[PDB]
């Protein structure tokens, strides 16, 4: 008699379950003409890497702003189905930034303080969203 059909994992990792934490800009690929437009789309916000729990792996948040009591634009790690690290024709292509597209057709355009610490995140997320078993 059971019900769950999860498996026994049981791992005595002695990590910190936060892969990684830092204070970025973040923006949304869209139209955003909800106005004359001018100042730098990019907004403030904190991106904060921590484990999830009942089922899920990982869940991405966007503090916004990054001293708000909760995230703004909290996304799940598995909403995310691929990472693009390219950058179109009017970016500069900065050393520090990352696109991240969901399940949902959103690409998010973060900024880290430079390539170093971009690159870092990357991982982080990949190194999740990948990790994540095939089923359940």
Same mark, same amino acid.
């Given at each position: 008699g059971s019900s769950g059909s999860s498996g026994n994992l049981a791992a005595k990792v002695? $990590? =910190?379950? /936060?892969?990684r934490e830092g204070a970025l800009r973040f923006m949304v690929a869209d139209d955003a003409a909800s106005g004359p437009g001018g100042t730098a789309q990019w907004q403030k916000c904190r991106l904060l890497l921590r484990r999830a729990v009942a089922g899920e792996r990982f869940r991405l948040e966007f503090? =916004?702003?990054? &001293? #708000? %009591?909760?995230? &703004? =634009? %909290? /996304?799940? $790690? %598995? #909403? /995310?189905i691929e990472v693009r690290t390219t950058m179109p024709l009017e970016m500069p292509e900065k050393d520090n930034t990352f696109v991240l597209k969901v399940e949902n057709g959103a690409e998010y355009i973060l900024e880290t303080i430079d390539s170093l610490q971009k690159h870092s995140w990357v991982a982080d997320i990949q190194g999740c969203v990948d990790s994540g078993p095939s089923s359940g």
């Open positions: 002695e $990590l =910190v379950d /936060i892969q503090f =916004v702003p990054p &001293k #708000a %009591s909760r995230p &703004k =634009v %909290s /996304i799940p $790690l %598995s #909403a /995310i």
